[PDB]
Nucleic acid binder design. Structure first.
Ligand SMILES: [Zn+2]
Ligand SMILES: [Zn+2]
Lengths: 113, 114
DNA sequence: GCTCTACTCATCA
DNA sequence: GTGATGACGTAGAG
């Protein structure tokens, strides 16, 4: 029986993380480790990691799950990305957490001026 | 036989203006009235009339002729629009020739700022 | 804590 | 006198 890669105990994987994101992780372990497994909206990815629309629209770069827009089914679909992929791309791009914060620090300044 | 709408004499229409732009205009009248019949590139339409990419990209709005990009076949194709259509849309948008010139006047100022 | 892009120019294509 | 768009961010519509 294949095991969850975090606990090595559960054998029933979370259907979203497994099927959409290709992660053999159980639902419990996913709540226990949001730092790796939380789902982020497109908008949160841009706020948190400073990724651009072109990066987040690239079908070849991230797995994504889509849902109806909660404000209205007639609006553009909500797009959910998994934190570990988004973060790994953001660290490659800005140079680790070290660099990402530099860019946070940067944007906060011009925020005033 | 049907006659050119500018001269009322010629019977063979310019192939581009007829087939692509639906104007029964002979080639000679087209050279004689560029103020209506000259063909403008996409970039020229933006420069001259302050039309935006969404307006010029709207397939339902203007007739267009496409050619190979003269800088390179591998670049984005060149797009040619006929001045009467582009001008008539621009006068509607900015308010005749008059409003258009105000927008010229306006844009030269912010240019001086920088 | 929703998404998409229009809102004047280098650069690349 | 070539075309398309991303680039300090973001309102507004959707
Ligand atoms: Zn587990
Ligand atoms: Zn004629």
């Amino acid at each position: 029986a294949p095991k969850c890669i975090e606990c090595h105990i559960n054998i029933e994987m979370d259907p979203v993380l497994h099927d959409v994101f290709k992660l053999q992780v159980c639902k419990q372990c996913s709540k226990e480790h949001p730092e790796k497994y939380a789902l982020l909206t497109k908008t949160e990815c841009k706020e948190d990691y400073f990724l651009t629309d072109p990066e987040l629209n690239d079908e070849d770069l991230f797995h994504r799950l889509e849902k109806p827009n909660p404000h209205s089914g007639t609006f553009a679909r909500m797009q959910l990305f998994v934190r570990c992929e988004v973060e790994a791309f953001a660290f490659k791009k800005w140079g680790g957490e070290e660099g990402l914060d530099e860019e946070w620090q940067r944007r906060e300044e011009g925020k005033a001026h």
